Structure formats: C-alpha cells, structure tokens
Design a protein around this ligand. Structure first.
Ligand SMILES: COC[C@H]1O[C@@H](O[C@H]2[C@H](OC)[C@@H](OC)[C@@H](O[C@H]3[C@H](OC)[C@@H](OC)[C@H](O[C@H]4[C@H](OS(=O)(=O)O)[C@@H](OS(=O)(=O)O)[C@@H](O[C@H]5[C@H](OC)[C@@H](OC)[C@H](O[C@H]6[C@H](OC)[C@@H](OS(=O)(=O)O)[C@@H](OC)O[C@@H]6COS(=O)(=O)O)O[C@H]5C(=O)O)O[C@@H]4COS(=O)(=O)O)O[C@@H]3C(=O)O)O[C@@H]2COS(=O)(=O)[O-])[C@H](OC)[C@@H](OC)[C@@H]1O[C@H]1O[C@H](COC)[C@@H](O[C@@H]2O[C@H](COC)[C@@H](O[C@H]3O[C@H](COC)[C@@H](O[C@@H]4O[C@H](COC)[C@@H](O[C@H]5O[C@H](COC)[C@@H](O[C@@H]6O[C@H](COC)[C@@H](O[C@H]7O[C@H](COS(=O)(=O)[O-])[C@@H](O[C@@H]8O[C@H](COS(=O)(=O)[O-])[C@@H](O[C@H]9O[C@H](COS(=O)(=O)O)[C@@H](O[C@H]%10O[C@H](COS(=O)(=O)O)[C@@H](OS(=O)(=O)O)[C@H](OS(=O)(=O)O)[C@H]%10OS(=O)(=O)O)[C@H](OS(=O)(=O)O)[C@H]9OS(=O)(=O)O)[C@H](OS(=O)(=O)[O-])[C@H]8OS(=O)(=O)[O-])[C@H](OC)[C@H]7OC)[C@H](OC)[C@H]6OC)[C@H](OC)[C@H]5OC)[C@H](OC)[C@H]4OC)[C@H](OC)[C@H]3OC)[C@H](OC)[C@H]2OC)[C@H](OC)[C@H]1OC
Ligand SMILES: *[C@@H]1O[C@H](CO)[C@@H](O[C@@H]2O[C@H](CO)[C@@H](O)[C@H](O)[C@H]2NC(C)=O)[C@H](O)[C@H]1NC(C)=O
Ligand SMILES: *[C@@H]1O[C@H](CO[C@@H]2O[C@@H](C)[C@@H](O)[C@@H](O)[C@@H]2O)[C@@H](O)[C@H](O)[C@H]1NC(C)=O
Ligand SMILES: *[C@H]1O[C@H](CO[C@@H]2O[C@@H](C)[C@@H](O)[C@@H](O)[C@@H]2O)[C@@H](O)[C@H](O)[C@H]1NC(C)=O
Ligand SMILES: *[C@@H]1O[C@H](CO)[C@@H](O)[C@H](O)[C@H]1NC(C)=O
Lengths: 47, 415, 252, 252, 46
C-alpha cells in the first residue's frame, strides 16, 4: 500500500490530503503513464 | 432602500386599519422593539396550541417570526373580520396605532436589523412571497408597497390551467432565493385548479458554535423519551464556560451562542421528575425572559444530542383552530387591498412553510463527520452536567432584541 | 512548454488553469493541493512591470482540463476565488524571490478521474528527491518556443541541476528559495517551461510510496530552452512555513 | 542586577560590556559566542526614545572584565566593531519583540582565563532546559535597584516562569520570542535584572554535557524586582535561524 | 564534553568546539559558589 502521513488539518485545509498524489486513471488502476519510468530511472546512483 | 428609509419617506397606508376596543435596547427603534415583543407573545401561544395538538413524543419546530412576518403581508390588504382575526391571532392588536397602521414597514425594519449579522459563521436565510391566480387583477398600490417593504411583488401564476407548472415556478424561485437548500417548498400536487392565493414562507439558519463539540467526545447513548421507552442517540459532550441557570422546580436553562454572539440557542430542560408538558403550560413571554435575565456564565459540562427537527404540521389548520378563519374562507375572506370586487372573492388557499434545524458538533446547518468513535474520554463517572438525555425545549434567538426566530422541542433525536 | 509532448488524460489531475474574467484570457498555471486550496506563482497575481494586480473578483480557476482552448463540458470544473494570499516576502523588484501564492476556492471542487490533488513534501522527501540528476516533471499550456500555443496540456521531464551550476549560469541573483532544472549543453537533450507556464507544478514521484509530490512552481528563466541556461522554480518545501500559516488562519 | 552578588573571577568569561566612546559610558551587556561575534539586545544599539542610534564607529566592546569602572590591564580586552546587524523585524516604534542584534569584531579576540565564548542552544537543549521551574543565571553591571551601580559584575540565579503566568502578570503583549524568569510572589526569594543589564546573557548549565548555554538576552520589564512582576528575556533559540543567516553572509 | 558544532568557523570564527567550558572552573574541575543551585533546580516531580 501507499504510506502517507498527513500534515495539515482538514478543518482548514479541506479534504483530499490523505489520498494525495495517486492518480485515478493511473496509480489507482495500476497503470503507468508514457514517461514516468523516466523519472523512476533517474534515481539511479552510478558508482 | 428600506433599511434607512422612514415611514413618511414612502406613503403607504392600508385600505383598512384596525383599532382595539381598548428598558429598551440601545441603538434600537422603539417601534421595532414593541413589534418584536408582539411576535414573542404569538410564539408562546402558537407553540402551546401546537403542543396540545400533538403527541408528546413528537419533535416540534417552527419559526414564529417567519409566520408573523408573512401573515402581516395579508394584513396590508385585509378588512373587517378578516383583518380583526389577523390582528388578534398574531397579537398585533396589542401595539400602538402607528406601528399597527405601518406594520408591514416595521417588519421590514425589524428584518433589516436581523440580517445585519452575516458573520458568515452566522447566516440567516429566508424567502417569503405570495402567489395569486393570474385571472385576478391585483391592486398596483399594493404591488408597489410590496416591492419595497417585502422585496418582491405578489407573483401571478396560472393555478387554473397550469397548476403543476406553477408549482415548479414557485419551487424554482425559492430554490434560487435560498440557493439550493429549499428546492421543494411546495410538494407534489399541492397546487391545483381550485388554488387562488398561496403564502410561501421559508427560513433556516447556518451558524457555527462559538464553542464547538469535539467529534471525538460524541457517543451512542440512551435518550429517555416521554412514552417511557428509551432509544440510542448521538450524544455530544464538552466542558466549558456557558451562561447557565438552575431555576424553579429544578428546571435548567442553558445558552449556547453561535460565532458572533448575536444569535444563540437556549435549552430548557426540566428535572427527570417534572415533565416537559408542565413547563410548556407555564411558558409565557415574561417567564422565558425572566429566565434569560437570570443566566450567568459558569464552567460546566454538557451532554447534548445531535438532532434534526422540522415544522411538519399544517399552518393553515393550526391557525384556523386559533381564530384565523375568514382569511381562509372563500366566502368570508376580506382582502380588498389586494384584489377588489366579489365575483370569486380572494382568500388564502394555502400557507406553505418550511423551517428546520440540524444541530451537530459544528453547529447549525454545518457539515461534520457522522462517524462516531468508541474510546475512553477520561470523564468523571460521577460528573454533574446539563444532561439533555430527555425531552427539552429549544429556542434560537437574536440578542439584544430577544427576538424569537425559532422555537421547538426535541422529544426524539434518535434513529 | 518547449520540447514536450501532449499530456495523457488524467495524467496531471492537479493541474489548474488561472483564467481572467475580463477580458477573457488564459493567465497562468496552478496546482490543486486540496478541495479548497490552489497553489500558484505570486507574479501571476502581482507584477507591476506587466501592470498586473488582480483581486479575487478578477480571476477564475478551471480544473480538470486537457484542451487549452475548449470548454470541456461535464469534465472541467470552474471555481471562483474567495481570497488570494501572496507571500509577504515576495520580491517582484529584483529576482522573483519567494514567487508563491495561495488561492482559496469559493466552493470546494469535487474530485474525479480528472481532478485530484497533489502532495506537498515534508523535510525528508524534499531532502531525498531534490538532488542533482533526479528528474521531475513540468506541465502547462504555455508557449512552445521562446520566439505558438499548444492545443492540449504539454508535459516534459527535466533533471534537477546542481546549485553552483544554477548560480554560475546567470548573473541574476538566485536564492535558496529557488532551484533550477534542465539539461546541460553537453547532455544533448533539451526541454524547458516557457512564458505562460508560470504557476504550474514541477512534480516528482516518490519511489517510497509511489505518490506524486509538488517540489516547485514554474517561476522564471532567461528566454526558453537556451543552451547553458536553466528554468527556475520556487522551492515549495522551503516556503512551507508560510503555506501552513496562511492555511491555518484563513482556511476554515 | 537586583538581589544578586559579586561574581567570581572567570565565572562568566563570555560576559561583554558595550561601551560608548563619546561620552565614555557603560551602555549595556552583551555575550561572546566566538572570537569574532558578539550577541546583544537590539534596543541597546537602536532606541530613538532614548536618543540612541549607534553605528560601529561610536561603540566599543570590553571583554574579560570584572570591575565595572577600573580598567583591567592584561586581563580585559577592548575591541572595535566592524559592523552591527539588527534583527530585520525589530521595530523600536512598536515593542521589544525580536530584541536581538549581532556585532562583528574588527579583529578576532584571543581567549584566556577571562575570555571564553558561551554555547548557543540546539533544538533539543532548548526544549529540555527551557522549562518552568528550572533556574538560569543572569549577569550584569546594571543598577542594584529600581530606585546604585556595583563595583564588580553582579550575578543572580532565577527560575523560569510558565508562559501563562508571564502573560497574566502584565498588560503588555508577550510573544513567542520572549520568556520570563523570576520568583513568584509567594516563593520568598527575589532578584531580577535591571537598567544597564540589557544585552546581557541568561545562561543555563546543561546536565548532559556540563556546558553553559545562552538561552536568553536581558530585554525588559516593568520597573525592576517588583512583586508580581517578572523579568523578560529574548528567546535566543527561536531567533537562531536569523542568527545563522547573518553569520553565513557577513562572517567571512 | 559532548558537543556537536552548528556553525562553520569560516564565517563564525573559532571557539564553538570548546564553547561553554570555563578555564577556571570546568577545565579545573571546580564549581563556582552558586552553580549547585542550578543543577538542583532540575528536579522533575512525577
Ligand atoms: C450610527 O448609526 C448606527 C445605526 O443606527 C440605526 O438607527 C437606530 C438609531 O441609532 C442611532 C437609534 O437611535 C437611538 C434609533 O433611532 C430611532 C429613534 O429612536 C430614538 C426614533 O425615535 C422615536 C425615531 O422615530 C422617528 C420616527 O421614525 S419611525 O421609524 O419610528 O416612525 C419618525 O417617523 S416619521 O414618519 O415621521 O419619519 C418620526 O415619528 C414621529 C412623528 O414626527 C415627529 C410624529 O408626527 C407627529 C408621529 O406622531 C404619531 C404618534 O407617535 C407618538 C402616534 O402615537 S402612537 O401611540 O400611535 O404611536 C400616533 O398619535 C397618537 O400617530 C402620530 C402621527 O403618526 S403619523 O404616522 O400619522 O405621522 O410619530 C412620531 C414617532 O415617534 O413615531 O420621528 C421619530 C423621532 O425621530 S427623531 O429623529 O427626532 O429621533 O426613529 C429612529 C430610527 O429608527 O431611525 O433606532 C434606529 C433604528 O434601529 S433599528 O432597531 O430599527 O435598526 C440605523 O438603523 C436604521 C443603522 O442603519 C442605518 C445605523 O447603522 C448604519 O450606519 C452606521 C453609521 O453610518 C456609517 C454604520 O456605522 C459605521 O460602520 C462603519 C463600518 O463598520 C464596519 C464604521 O467604520 C469604522 O469601523 C470599520 C470597521 O472596523 C473594524 C473600519 O473598517 C475596517 O477597517 C479595518 C482596518 O483597516 C485599516 C479593517 O481591518 C481588516 O483589514 C486589515 C488590513 O487592511 C489592509 C487587517 O489588518 C491587518 O492585519 C495584518 C496582520 O496583523 C497581525 C497586518 O499585517 C502586518 O502586520 C503583521 C503583524 O506584525 S507583527 O509585528 O505583529 O508580527 C505581519 O504579520 C507578521 O509577519 C511576520 C513576518 O514578516 S515578514 O516581513 O517576514 O513577512 C511574522 O513573523 C514570523 O515569520 C517567520 C516566517 O517567515 S516566512 O515568511 O519566511 O515563512 C519567522 O521567521 C523565521 O523563519 C523564517 C523561515 O524559516 S524556515 O526555516 O521555515 O524556512 C526565516 O526566513 S528564512 O528566509 O531564513 O527562511 C527567518 O529568518 S530570517 O533571517 O529570514 O528573518 C526566521 O526568523 S527568525 O527570527 O525566527 O529566526 C517567524 O516565525 S517563526 O515560526 O520562525 O517563529 C517570524 O518572525 S519573528 O521575527 O517574529 O520570529 C509574524 O508571525 S508571528 O506569529 O511569528 O509574529 C506575523 O504576525 S502575524 O500575527 O500576522 O502572524 C504582516 O506581515 C509582515 C504585516 O504586513 C501584512 C496589516 O498591516 C499592518 C493590517 O492592516 C494594516 C485587519 O486585521 C487582519 C482586518 O480586520 C481583522 C476592516 O476590514 C477590512 C474594515 O472593515 C471592513 C472603518 O475604517 C475603514 C472605520 O472607519 C472609521 C463607522 O465608524 C466607526 C461606523 O460609524 C458609526 C453602520 O455600520 C456599522 C450601519 O449599518 C449598521
Ligand atoms: C437567482 O438569484 C440571484 C440572486 O440571488 C438573482 O440575480 C440577482 O439579481 C439581482 C436583481 O435584483 C442583482 O442585483 C444581483 O446582482 C443578481 N445576482 C446576485 C449577485 O445576487 C437571479 O435573478 C435569480 N434567478 C432566478 C431563478 O430568478
Ligand atoms: C493593488 O491593489 C490596489 C489597486 O486597485 C485599484 O486599481 C489600481 C489600478 C489603482 O487605481 C489603485 O489605486 C486601486 O485601488 C492598490 O491599492 C495597490 O497599490 C495595488 N498594488 C500595487 C503595488 O500595484
Ligand atoms: C538613526 O541613524 C541615522 C542617523 O544618521 C544621521 O545623523 C542623525 C543625527 C540624523 O541627522 C539623521 O537624519 C542622519 O541620517 C538615520 O539615517 C536612521 O534612519 C536613524 N534610525 C532610526 C530608525 O531612527
Ligand atoms: C388599492 O389600494 C389603495 C391603498 O391600499 C386604495 O386606496 C385603492 O382604493 C386600491 N385600489 C383599488 C384596486 O381599488
């Protein structure tokens, strides 16, 4: 699962923070967009 | 502009006037004050009467201010017995002649003063209006006066041939005026071919408590109804300073203000022994007022249930049994000032009303989580609180006029 | 966005379009962080040099859009602004320091397949992801080149650049409240944000929880996609103290 | 200092005396945090109501002193100032919030038995030591009573007071950048800083590493040592961020 | 004495590493006349 600790108070922030960053048409359907792999690959730390 | 205008700034004067055989708030007009007092006498009377007509286990709710205000719109053009009944039922026959002759105008002033809050954590919203069949010819003087003093003119509709369509037209106006909230003041088939004149008076309050209840403290607890039974209700709780007072025969009075303090909710809770009914029979304008004066801030704990009450009763029926008869009679109705003659005489075919109150941890008409937790709240099991786990009375009032905007009874907040 | 490509549907559900009521025109990009709050660049709201000093009433936000020029019925949602909040330390005289602003929606927007908020980073995420060589993504309906406008939202991924390299790349005084991104000349590839994209989000996906975090706001640059030059973005985490303060006292 | 006692030699090696060149007069207290940096209270350098508006050139710092008036050969050391820096939000016109300032020395001072810098608290030390009940130490050459100068440096230990009690003791607004210390009206003992003591340090000895940390700067009060009143100090840790920024860009 | 530096002596100058320790007291394992009073104040009633 996706672990995320909220920071704001929904009383003033409104709602949506708990499920922030997960796209209905992508993450939530276990689908990847055409270029996100490029971002994941950039975390490589060559030695 | 009416809020700044004066009685003579715009010549009105009804077609008929009535005469009875026989510490005012600072920055407050005397006329408006006496008119607020009149509504308060109507409030108690209309309330006791309604309670006598229902089951002591039913919740009761109404906006006397809304009712008085709207029916004063008919006064403006009533004569003879019709007018006298209006004056006596709504207690208007108990005020000065000037205020009486200009009643409509002063209701406008009174209302201007009430809607000068909008501390957006405190919004009062209303929509009042009259609709008459378009076959009739309405007095234009009335219409103009209505335009200024009431905001709108009586809207002509075709009840005779376009009943359902006219229903939608009325609902639409209200759905817009209270934007979204009230979209069906007039229910299915309420308007029809025999419909000639309809009174529509709606109103509700949106406000946040100055001191909210913590959702974390609300627990499913028992509410001891009047029929002896008991049920589960989301009982809220909190500790804090509040204006309170233990009165005669052990009755308890508590005031919970909304953000701003110009509008509060007052609760009257009898002791387990004495029943609510007894109290209602003793509830007079001076009794209620004497109680409120006795209030003083105290640090205390409060157990109050979430509740939703509405004005589900027939206004016309209720008023007829109180004395307002002619206004509703096709034969005896005397409304010259709105439409003249005698072919089909003008009478009120229906008084559609809508007033409700939804109270939760956040306030009135405020959104809050339904989810009710189950955990320890670390409370003194031997605590002594204002515990409203049995039938109590409710008042929504405006300070400093003491105007009773809403009044009711919470007999069953369960389910 | 220069050298980008059409975004896919629902690819950036937190993408917000700032629109001017009169005359009707596209102003900037922005991002949704909740159902009632929207983030953007300060100079998109206040920038005398372009004689812009908007108030809540002059603006409007359109959410869940893809097409730049069409009204996407039943898909996009429009909201009025209740209040605008510009960073009190925003510097429009010199270098657009602290180029950030918050906008409260008059009425909460409803989330859908096309509308969903992005996450704001914490200290660890910021320290971990915001490093030279790691790539983020920028989106917007801005210009396609320095010297015209796309039909649909554009997207491009760019590598974070080392601070000393950002600093030596321009004579403009840069601050800790900004970071720069873009390919170096010796890297071959290119891409950049451009006029019209300001306010838009620079996002990164966390490999820890698979969520998208907004690390920056498109702010400024010198021309668009020039060699040896980099786009600059408002460092969001660095200004979180202000983001939290504003939301705490004006949110409810 | 009121109700204190003569300090021992080398007892407070970080205590600095701010001296005015013309006329020659003891102005305030201050503290040594390094061989080139001195800490003091903003209003000691800038307070128009007192006709005080100094620059580096009008001032002198005297480090390593014990006697108030007597010059101490080969013991004390007089240093000129290169530049002074007042907190940017300090506003003598409104109140004494952010009552803090830094002074850079013309040239580095040599340490000795009488000259040694004090430590500035980290977040943990701050949170752990700055608690109601715990006692700190205040040093100065100020007045011995509200209504009187000492021949040698004075010292007194005082307890930190709960914020709500600090706030209920005065009609003046108390900010998070201040804390108060002193004995309550029913504790029997007394003591307080006084006029001439401002700028001085309020230190505490860490039981963890046995080192002395400066938690506050003598700032203000209503009179000196009055019953039911408390002395007010600038909260050093809470303004540490600003201290770091001034040192980073003006220290070299 | 355990002490982690916070500043860069390049802009801070020297002295932070040995801060808070007095040549005539801590360095000579000597207490001053009233410091005992400070340590006693750290009692934490439970
Ligand atoms: C008057 O009038 C009134 C009313 O009236 C009414 O009426 C009433 C009356 O009254 C009078 C009464 O009287 C009594 C009554 O009367 C009545 C009477 O009685 C008596 C009676 O008598 C009897 C009468 O009567 C009458 C009659 O009539 S009737 O009706 O009755 O009828 C007549 O008639 S006729 O017809 O004639 O006409 C008559 O009568 C009479 C007659 O003759 C004679 C006769 O003849 C013969 C008659 O005779 C008769 C008799 O009688 C007896 C009878 O009798 S019986 O019995 O029946 O009855 C008979 O015989 C038997 O008859 C006869 C005959 O008849 S016939 O019909 O036919 O004819 O009669 C006799 C009788 O009596 O009746 O005569 C009589 C008598 O007469 S006489 O005359 O002679 O008497 O009547 C009378 C009547 O009624 O009328 O009564 C009345 C009525 O009543 S009721 O009830 O009804 O209703 C009226 O009514 C009507 C009314 O209406 C009209 C009235 O009213 C109205 O009017 C009035 C007047 O006019 C006008 C009015 O009033 C008015 O009003 C107005 C308005 O109001 C509203 C007013 O005005 C005023 O007021 C107003 C209000 O106010 C409130 C105003 O306005 C306003 O204004 C304001 C101001 O403005 C200016 C506003 O406000 C707002 O807004 C504003 C703005 O603006 C623009 C705002 O403010 C603001 O605020 C703000 C804030 O503050 C606070 C500000 O801001 C500023 O400041 C601030 C503060 O400061 S301080 O110093 O303190 O602080 C700030 O903030 C701050 O900041 C800071 C910062 O800074 S900077 O520079 O920086 O930016 C902070 O700090 C912190 O920070 C931080 C952070 O940062 S960041 O950003 O960056 O984030 C920190 O720091 C730290 O950290 C950082 C960061 O870090 S981290 O790590 O995180 O990143 C750092 O940085 S870095 O870079 O480094 O990063 C730093 O460092 S450094 O180096 O840089 O530095 C650090 O540091 S450190 O040191 O710490 O280390 C921090 O924190 S932490 O956490 O840290 O701690 C910090 O610092 S520190 O240092 O401190 O530490 C801060 O925070 S903190 O907390 O902390 O502190 C902050 O603070 S805070 O607090 O804020 O938070 C800011 O910024 C800067 C600044 O800037 C912005 C501002 O500025 C200054 C300000 O502004 C300026 C405000 O607030 C908010 C707001 O508020 C709220 C407002 O709003 C807007 C406004 O409003 C809107 C105005 O002005 C305008 C004024 O004016 C003057 C006025 O005046 C007063 C008034 O006047 C009065 C009313 O209304 C009210 C109306 O309506 C109501
Ligand atoms: C819906 O309601 C709005 C107002 O609640 C009506 O529009 C307003 O009309 C008045 C005319 O007296 C203007 O002064 C306002 O500016 C208008 N809008 C605002 C800001 O309230 C509208 O006419 C209503 N529509 C219907 C269903 O009749
Ligand atoms: C932004 O807010 C105000 C501008 O609003 C109004 O329209 C402008 C064109 C001027 O005529 C102004 O006087 C009017 O109030 C200004 O008060 C404020 O200074 C503006 N900010 C800046 C710095 O441009
Ligand atoms: C005080 O410091 C400066 C004073 O410098 C100059 O000499 C004094 C005697 C005046 O003649 C003054 O006008 C001259 O500038 C001021 O520039 C500075 O603003 C003053 N500080 C404050 C905040 O009052
Ligand atoms: C209309 O009403 C006015 C006053 O209310 C009255 O004077 C007038 O006679 C009426 N007109 C009609 C339709 O008879």
């Amino acid at each position: 699962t996706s672990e995320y600790q909220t920071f704001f108070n929904p009383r003033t922030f409104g709602s949506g923070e708990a499920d922030c960053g997960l796209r209905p048409l992508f993450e939530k359907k276990s689908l990847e967009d055409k270029t996100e792999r490029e971002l994941l690959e950039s975390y490589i730390d060559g030695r | 502009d009416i809020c700044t205008a004066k009685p003579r700034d715009i010549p009105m004067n009804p077609m008929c006037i009535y005469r009875s055989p026989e510490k005012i708030p600072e920055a407050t007009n005397r006329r408006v004050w006496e008119l607020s007092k009149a509504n308060s006498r109507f409030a108690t009377t209309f309330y006791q009467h309604l309670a006598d007509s229902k089951n002591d286990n039913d919740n009761i709710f109404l906006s006397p201010l809304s009712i008085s205000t709207a029916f004063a719109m008919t006064k403006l053009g009533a004569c003879n017995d019709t007018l006298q009944q209006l004056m006596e039922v709504f207690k208007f026959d108990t005020i000065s002649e000037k205020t009486s002759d200009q009643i409509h105008f002063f209701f406008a002033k009174l209302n201007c003063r009430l809607y000068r809050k909008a501390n957006k954590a405190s919004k009062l919203v209303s929509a009042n209006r009259l609709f008459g069949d378009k076959s009739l010819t309405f007095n234009e003087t009335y219409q103009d006066i209505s335009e200024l003093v009431y905001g709108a003119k009586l809207q002509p509709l075709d009840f005779k041939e376009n009943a359902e369509q006219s229903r939608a037209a009325i609902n639409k106006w209200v759905s817009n005026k209270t934007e979204g909230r009230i979209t069906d003041v007039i229910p299915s088939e309420a308007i029809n071919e025999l419909t000639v004149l309809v009174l529509v008076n709606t109103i509700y309050f949106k406000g946040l408590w100055k001191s909210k209840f913590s959702p974390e403290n609300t627990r499913k607890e028992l509410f001891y109804k009047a029929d002896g039974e008991s049920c589960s209700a989301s009982m809220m709780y909190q500790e804090g300073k509040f204006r309170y007072r233990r009165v005669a025969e052990g009755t308890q009075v508590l005031e919970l203000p909304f953000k701003g303090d110009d509008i509060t909710m007052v609760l009257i809770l009898p002791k387990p022994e004495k029943s609510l009914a007894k109290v209602e029979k003793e509830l007079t304008p001076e009794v209620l007022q004497e109680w409120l004066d006795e209030l003083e801030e105290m640090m205390l704990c409060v157990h109050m249930p979430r509740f939703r009450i509405e004005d589900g009763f027939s206004l016309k029926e209720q008023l007829q049994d109180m004395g307002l008869v002619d206004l509703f009679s096709p034969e005896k109705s005397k409304l010259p000032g709105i439409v003249a003659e005698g072919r089909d005489d003008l009478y009120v075919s229906d008084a559609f009303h809508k007033a409700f109150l939804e109270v939760n941890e956040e306030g009135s008409e405020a959104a809050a989580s339904t989810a009710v937790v189950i955990a320890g709240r670390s409370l003194n099991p031997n605590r002594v609180c204002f515990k409203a786990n049995r039938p109590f009375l409710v008042f929504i009032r405006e300070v400093p006029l003491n105007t009773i905007i809403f009044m009711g009874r919470v007999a069953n907040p369960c389910v | 966005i220069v050298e980008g490509s059409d975004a896919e549907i629902g690819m950036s559900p937190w993408q917000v379009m700032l629109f001017r009521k009169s005359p009707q025109e596209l102003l900037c990009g922005a991002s949704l962080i909740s159902d009632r709050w929207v983030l953007t660049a300060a100079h998109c709201l206040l920038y005398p040099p372009w004689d812009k000093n908007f108030t809540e009433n002059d603006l409007l936000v359109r959410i869940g859009k893809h097409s730049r020029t069409r009204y996407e019925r039943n898909i996009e949602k429009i909201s009025m602004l209740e209040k605008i909040y510009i960073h009190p330390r925003y510097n429009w005289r010199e270098n657009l320091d602290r180029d950030i602003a918050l906008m409260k929606l008059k009425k909460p927007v409803a989330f859908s397949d096309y509308i969903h908020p992005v996450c704001l980073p914490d200290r660890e995420t910021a320290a971990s992801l915001l490093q030279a060589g790691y790539k983020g993504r920028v989106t917007g309906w801005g210009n396609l080149k320095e010297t015209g406008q796309p039909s649909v939202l554009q997207v491009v991924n760019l590598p974070i650049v080392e601070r000393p390299v950002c600093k030596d790349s321009t004579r403009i005084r840069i601050t800790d409240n900004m970071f720069c991104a873009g390919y170096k000349p010796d890297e071959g590839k290119r891409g950049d944000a451009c006029e019209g994209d300001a306010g838009g989000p620079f996002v990164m996906k966390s490999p820890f929880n698979n969520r998208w975090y907004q690390m920056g706001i498109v702010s400024w640059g010198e021309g668009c996609d020039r060699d040896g030059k980099y786009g600059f973005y408002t460092h969001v985490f660095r200004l979180k103290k202000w983001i939290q303060k504003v939301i705490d006292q004006f949110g409810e």
